[PDB]
Amino acid sequence: TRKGIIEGEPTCCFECVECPDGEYSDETDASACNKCPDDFWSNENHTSCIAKEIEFLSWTEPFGIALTLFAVLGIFLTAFVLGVFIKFRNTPIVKATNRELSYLLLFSLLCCFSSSLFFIGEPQDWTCRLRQPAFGISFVLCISCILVKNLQFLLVFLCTFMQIVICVIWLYTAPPSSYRNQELEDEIIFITCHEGSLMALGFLIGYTCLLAAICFFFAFKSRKLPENFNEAKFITFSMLIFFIVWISFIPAYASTYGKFVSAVEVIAILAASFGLLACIF
Amino acid sequence: EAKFITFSMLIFFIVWISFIPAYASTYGKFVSAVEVIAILAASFGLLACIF
Amino acid sequence: TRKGIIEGEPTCCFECVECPDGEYSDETDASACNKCPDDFWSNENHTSCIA
Numbered sequence: 001t002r003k004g005i006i007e008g009e010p011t012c013c014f015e016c017v018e019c020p021d022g023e024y025s026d027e028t029d030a031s032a033c034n035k036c037p038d039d040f041w042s043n044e045n046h047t048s049c050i051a052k053e054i055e056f057l058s059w060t061e062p063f064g065i066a067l068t069l070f071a072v073l074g075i076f077l078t079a080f081v082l083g084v085f086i087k088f089r090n091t092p093i094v095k096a097t098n099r100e101l102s103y104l105l106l107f108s109l110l111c112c113f114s115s116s117l118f119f120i121g122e123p124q125d126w127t128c129r130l131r132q133p134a135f136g137i138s139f140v141l142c143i144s145c146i147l148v149k150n151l152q153f154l155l156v157f158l159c160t161f162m163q164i165v166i167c168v169i170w171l172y173t174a175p176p177s178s179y180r181n182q183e184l185e186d187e188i189i190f191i192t193c194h195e196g197s198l199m200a201l202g203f204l205i206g207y208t209c210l211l212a213a214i215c216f217f218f219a220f221k222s223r224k225l226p227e228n229f230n231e232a233k234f235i236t237f238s239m240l241i242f243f244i245v246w247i248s249f250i251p252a253y254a255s256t257y258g259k260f261v262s263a264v265e266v267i268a269i270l271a272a273s274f275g276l277l278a279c280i281f
Numbered sequence: 282e283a284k285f286i287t288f289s290m291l292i293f294f295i296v297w298i299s300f301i302p303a304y305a306s307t308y309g310k311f312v313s314a315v316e317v318i319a320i321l322a323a324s325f326g327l328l329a330c331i332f
Numbered sequence: 333t334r335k336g337i338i339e340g341e342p343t344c345c346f347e348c349v350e351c352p353d354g355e356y357s358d359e360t361d362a363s364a365c366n367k368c369p370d371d372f373w374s375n376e377n378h379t380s381c382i383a
């Protein structure tokens with residue numbers, strides 16, 4: 001507490017007044033309350049300084065363990081599919097479905113599933129730098145590989161090179177960085193990332209969504225050919241799932257406040273990937 | 282009508298799974314906004330898929 | 333703002349300390365800041381409280 005003034009009476013007479021939040025009194029007969037040191041907050045008794053709680057999406061939360069379980073299951077399923085394809089090689093269907101392109105697609109799907117682990121845990125600097133470009137490049141490679149499905153590799157590498165060059169331009173000009181946000185609550189510090197260049201993120205998302213749209217159009221144009229077990233139908237379905245996932249992702253990200261924002265991405269990515277894999281494999 | 286029922290169920294499930302995090306950590310009008318959006322999306326998906 | 337004791341000095345000598353949030357003072361030469369009523373809150377200038 002701190003000493004008050006009964007106006008009209010001498011200085012030897014005072015009244016004790018409670019020190020407010022963000023202030024404390026650690027001395028007998030104090031006149032003013034000291035402000036807490038930065039990254040510290042007054043306790044309930046207003047006499048000492050507890051540490052401000054650091055908040056992020058941890059691995060101990062049930063949400064984190066659930067997302068990790070789903071990601072590991074996706075990785076296992078992709079590896080299982082790749083092993084089955086490589087074991088039953090030189091067979092009619094596998095050789096009919098462009099073995100090499102299928103292997104590249106499965107590797108890129110493994111990359112897509114592994115790229116979701118950068119959005120979980122305390123965000124360090126390199127994780128914030130590698131969060132978006134990994135998924136962007138991997139999914140662009142996936143989409144191009146499906147679209148193409150030698151000359152094929154030359155065709156497939158160009159879109160990935162475009163994505164790589166825009167990503168490296170982004171990282172050279174203004175890279176993201178970690179941020180210890182202190183505005184959302186006076187007793188909690190939220191550790192997040194911060195995309196330095198919004199234009200690069202928008203361009204990356206738009207390029208991916210344009211490739212998806214082109215693939216969807218070419219799949220719907222040929223939705224009745226029965227070649228290769230009628231893969232056009234399932235490519236159409238995969239593109240539809242992708243578009244639904246991201247169109248529903250927009251409001252989910254817009255409405256979320258706090259750490260759980262990261263969660264939504266770890267959801268959306270996974271969902272999209274899963275759909276794709278199933279419909280094609 | 283197998284395809285349409287399956288797609289409607291997918292729309293419903295994807296919408297709610299995506300909106301779970303927003304429901305877990307939000308207080309205010311955005312809760313009602315999420316409710317209305319998730320109801321309208323499901324109803325529109327069902328109608329469009331079926332009829 | 334409110335009066336603040338300077339230790340070892342007579343009552344006529346004091347300091348001016350700004351009132352914190354949720355409390356206000358609407359007079360000159362104030363000793364203790366008041367408390368805004370229920371459903372009110374002090375303004376930025378802390379000269380009154382609005383609903």
Ligand SMILES: COc1cccc([C@@H](C)NCCCc2ccccc2Cl)c1
Nearest residue numbers: 132135136195204205206208209246265
């Ligand atoms: C086309 O689909 C994608 C292509 C690249 C990245 C992604 C996901 C992983 N992040 C979206 C970025 C969402 C966003 C928008 C504005 C401000 C901050 C943020 Cl964080 C999706």
Ligand SMILES: [Ca+2]
Nearest residue numbers: 007008009010
């Ligand atoms: Ca007197």
Ligand SMILES: [Ca+2]
Nearest residue numbers: 339340341342
């Ligand atoms: Ca004296």
